[PDB]
Ligand binder design. Structure first.
Ligand code: CL
Ligand code: CL
Ligand code: NA
Ligand code: NA
Ligand code: NA
Ligand code: NA
Length: 163
């Protein structure tokens, strides 16, 4: 298991424009296109992202290319953020993937505001952090995914992504 396999489990793979769990136009492995309600706006974003006239459909290779970029962008967003970088730097490789997963799903700004959960993670108070992370809109709206990510923070293992 690694961050790519983990996000592929959590995000799935779809080759045509779909709506994510928040109702927003998306494609591939959780590549958010736009928050605009306009499908035409989403199609412009898609053609721009892929570099061709896609008609709302992409290939697996194209989806994986966007995914490469999006994982990289989540990591760069962590490293540039004054609240997230110290936490990321304090974590082991497996728990770093859990933090990347959160940022991929919710964005840097949202995660960076969880000052209590972040402190508990940096303090390595894993069970406390896990309880605190569940007191979130994130956990309530996507509980199965959040449980997997939280178990990853709690244990430092990939156990929640087996089977
Ligand atoms: Cl555009
Ligand atoms: Cl879920
Ligand atoms: Na939906
Ligand atoms: Na992606
Ligand atoms: Na505490
Ligand atoms: Na603890």
């Amino acid at each position: 298991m690694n961050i790519f396999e983990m996000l592929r489990i959590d995000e799935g793979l779809r080759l045509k424009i779909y709506k994510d769990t928040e109702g927003y136009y998306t494609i591939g492995i959780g590549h958010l296109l736009t928050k605009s309600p306009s499908l035409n706006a989403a199609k412009c974003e898609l053609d721009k992202a892929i570099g061709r006239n896609t008609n709302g459909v992409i290939t697996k290779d194209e989806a994986e290319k966007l995914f490469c970029q999006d994982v990289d962008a989540a990591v760069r967003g962590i490293l540039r953020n004054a609240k997230l970088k110290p936490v990321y730097d304090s974590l082991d490789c497996v728990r770093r993937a859990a933090l990347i997963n959160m940022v991929f799903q919710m964005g840097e700004t949202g995660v960076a505001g969880f000052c209590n959960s972040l402190r508990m993670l940096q303090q390595k108070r894993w069970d406390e952090a896990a309880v605190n992370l569940a007191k979130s809109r994130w956990y309530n709206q996507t509980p199965n995914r959040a449980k997997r990510v939280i178990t990853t923070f709690r244990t430092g293992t990939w156990d929640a992504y087996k089977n």
